[PDB]
Structure formats: structure tokens, C-alpha cells
Design a protein around this ligand. Sequence first.
Ligand SMILES: CCCCCCCCO[C@@H]1O[C@H](CO)[C@@H](O)[C@H](O)[C@H]1O
Length: 574
Amino acid sequence: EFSRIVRDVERLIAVEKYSLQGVVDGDKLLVVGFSEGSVNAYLYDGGETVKLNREPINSVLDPHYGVGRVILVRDVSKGAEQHALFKVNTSRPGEEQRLEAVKPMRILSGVDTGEAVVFTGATEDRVALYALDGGGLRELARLPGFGFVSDIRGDLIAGLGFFGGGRVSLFTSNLSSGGLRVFDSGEGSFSSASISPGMKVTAGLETAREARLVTVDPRDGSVEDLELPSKDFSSYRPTAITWLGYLPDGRLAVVARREGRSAVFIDGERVEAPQGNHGRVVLWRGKLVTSHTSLSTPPRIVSLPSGEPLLEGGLPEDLRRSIAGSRLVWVESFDGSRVPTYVLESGRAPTPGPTVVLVHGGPFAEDSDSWDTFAASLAAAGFHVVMPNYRGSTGYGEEWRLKIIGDPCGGELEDVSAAARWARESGLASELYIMGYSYGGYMTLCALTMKPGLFKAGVAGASVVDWEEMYELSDAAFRNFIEQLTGGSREIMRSRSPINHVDRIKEPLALIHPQNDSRTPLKPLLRLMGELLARGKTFEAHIIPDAGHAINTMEDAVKILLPAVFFLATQRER
Ligand SMILES: CCCCCCCCO[C@@H]1O[C@H](CO)[C@@H](O)[C@H](O)[C@H]1O
């Protein structure tokens, strides 16, 4: 209701947000910005920003340093994520030419050397690595599951693949001849990779314990630790490695992290940076630049080590104030595991007060000290926010992440429930709600069906309600995803699907869903609405038009977020 809720939700979404993609058109920053109502690509060279694309896009391919063009990735299916590629000569912004040799497909990742575009894509029958050059399109290799291109140097192509059991393998190929070589580590998963001058692969390896840098030789697969000049990086003992890449001057840039915050290193030496999380690091005009974000700082571009902002959307002081504080707490779970949980105390709610356990998606993702529009809106609306990194989350080692494999709506739901208990027992919460999108929405449905009475009400957006029907509606990448998560078991696919436990729901439920979502399809949700109806269950639903899982306009963001906040405010009335 409140026109107040609406203005805050609108304003939070309206704040401009930027991601750093690279350096192009000689020496200009290439950035993707959620600005002017949607997701666009821009060039930045010290002053005014110049828009490269026409209609909104979803992303751009990673350009090689200085290339004179940008490759836009744009959904041509009204949200179903069948993307087409469009190139823009950086000397003629606004003029696009579609790469017609590439039929629409789910584009997963890509790099542009300036002479060749190398990308991974998913169709109904497969996931593959492709190369498009002066001679046309070539399929370099068929991949086992989600795979992403990380880097290209010379004829060598390096990437990361989720090829089995939740583990991430490294893979290589040749631009000229294609082919596939998969490198698995028995110690953990590779998280980042960049080809060295010596033509070997430098990669971040996340183990049960610490994460570390290694050198993989493509020719024989031998692996050895990589030691850097400066020991700052090694003594930091990172638990995860976000990204790494060689700068033009040959120096190795690494962004690593622990407990939800990251640090920047150049050849092993620490480089001061604003507190929170950082993205890729680029050398621009001899200077270091990166993206930065934190729970109170929308994604922005800054210079290091000063932290001065090059591109930044301003968060209004009043909205900034609605977040009275934040903490990282370690929730005690059913089996004694400690669940790292970020907490946001609303300056507009009392203590104890209305609290929302906002569950992250993925499952391979994490709640860190990074901007979260959903969280900020709840705080502005008067709710404390509890964000737990349930098992399956990234950021706390290989072991914690892999526990979810073969156990959806099992141990991780116990962690979500423990975070709820902690909220109550610690004195923060007077009443509890659960809210989440994607895997998080799945968790809302799992909570309401398997833990009736735990929460007062639940919000489920772009959620999974039935693994079976979703599977039958999935492309090659998502079918493989579901097989890995469920261990390939039909029993698990069925028993862990909320659609088969509707009778147990007792709390009000709000369903929010983009009509053309191709990751978590709408069809099974319509069946869920039928069951709720037939069983006399209380519920509301909001289906968003011409949109899918990847929101790319400010108005669509309002359509998926506003109903959620209105629903909770109304429940809060009792
Ligand atoms: C209510 C929440 C709506 C989320 C929809 C987000 C659509 C675009 O997503 C945003 O793009 C920016 C530009 O690259 C990034 O800096 C932001 O981190 C990212 O969320």
C-alpha cells in the first residue's frame, strides 16, 4: 500500500549500478551500467559516459585490452534468454551489426580477441564451446555441462566447467583446431584462470581449507603451486579466489576473499581498496581500477589505492540511514556446523522487531558484504534482514559448498531454519518471515511445506516447485545442473519438490514469477497455484509480462520487488 514503500523501492532500484568489463577503443574503460532505466554498455574516459548499444542488453563479452569493438549479448526472446550477439565498432557508438552466423541460444560466457569471438552456449541438446572468426562459426567442443570461457592467449583457450558432482574443472581448447582437455583436481575446484606468458594456466584452486594459486601445464596436466614476488597474498590466507588476470604490463592481479570481504593483490602485494567486495582489476592509463560494492554501497567503479570513484550512483543519505547496522554472525546449525550469516538491522524497526530471513539464490552463491537491493528495500521498509550462507554457498571452502550435492531441501534448509531460530533467540526478531528468489524461492517453498509454523509468511520469487517438470522443460545446461544437484535420483527429484507436500502449507504465501523464465519455468508454478486453490490454501501471485530470470529494466525490477514488500508490510499489520 504505502506510497512511501513505493518511492523507496523505486529510488533504491533507480540508483545507478556499474560493473567493470575491461579496456577498449585504445584506452577507454568499458563498463556495463544499470542506468537510465535499464542495462546498457558504456565507454568511460574521464568525463562523460558514452552509450554503445541501442536497446537494452544483458551483458558484453570480455574484450581483449584495447580492441576497437564490443560484442553485446542481448536476449531476443522477451526474457527466455535465447540471446543474439551484436557488435559495435567503438568508433561508431550506437551502430549495431548482428552476428547472424550465431543462431539464438543461451549464451553463457565469451571473450573477444578482436579477430575472433569465443563463447560457450547452451541449446536444447548440448552445451558447447564456439569460435566465430573471419571464416565463420565453428563448434570447438561439446561440454558436459555449464562451462565458461576464462581467457585466450595466442591459440590457447582456457575456461572453467561444472562438469560433475558440483566440482569445477579447468578446460582448454585450441582456437584453430578445437578439441577439449579437462583438468580436474582431487583437492577441490578451480575458480578462476588466466593464461601466462609461458602459455600455462594460472588458476585459483579452492580446497576444503584455504584457496591457493597454482600453475597447470596444459600439455601434461601437471600442477604446481605458484609463488609470487610479494608474500602479502599468501599470508592473507584467502578462502576463495574471485578473479585473477594478467595486466598489460605483465603483472598478475588477484582478487581473493574471506568471510564476505575481498582484497586486491598485484604480484602478491596488497593494494589498499574500499572495504567490501571487488571485481576485476584493470590497468587504465597506467592506473589501477576496479569495481567496488558493500552492503551500503551500490556497485561502483573506483581507482586504487585512493578509492576515489570514477563512476558511482549515489545512495541518498536517507536510504543509507535506514540501514542502522550490519553484522556477521555464526549461526549454530542442527549438526553443529556454523552458518556464516550477514545481518542488517533496520533503523526503521524496533528491537526485537519484524525480521526477514532473505535466502540467496544459486545455490552456488553467497551473501557477502556486497550491495543487495532486496535487503536494502526491506530495511527501508522496516524489517531487519538475516542472510545465511547455508551449505552449498560459495565463499567458505569446497567442503561447505559441496554438502548440498544430492541433498536439496535437506541440510541447507536446516541452516535456513537455524538462522530463523538464531534471529529469535538472539533478541533481534519479534516475528519472522522468509523471502527468496531463484534457489531462494525454492527455499521459501521448502520452508513452508516442511517447516510449517516456523515463519509467519513466505515470499517465493522465480522459484523451483518441482524438479521433475522443470527438468523436462530444461535445456542441456539446466538438465545437467539438476542431475548434479539431485545426484541423478528420481526419488530425490520427487521427494524434495514442494509440489508434493502442498497439504502441509499453513502460512500465507506470495508467488512472484516472470512469465518467460527459462531457468525456473512458470508452468510448474501454475500447477502449484492449482493445488493451493483446490486445497483451500491462502495465497497471492504476481506474474510479470515479457520478462524472464535476468531482469534488465528498472521497471521490471519494480514489478518483481514491489509486490514482495507490499505483501510483507500487509502481513506485518497481522
Ligand atoms: C529488485 C532487484 C532487481 C535486480 C535486477 C538487476 C538487473 C541488472 O543487474 C545489475 O547490473 C549492474 C550493471 O552491471 C550491476 O552492477 C549490478 O550489481 C546488477 O544487479
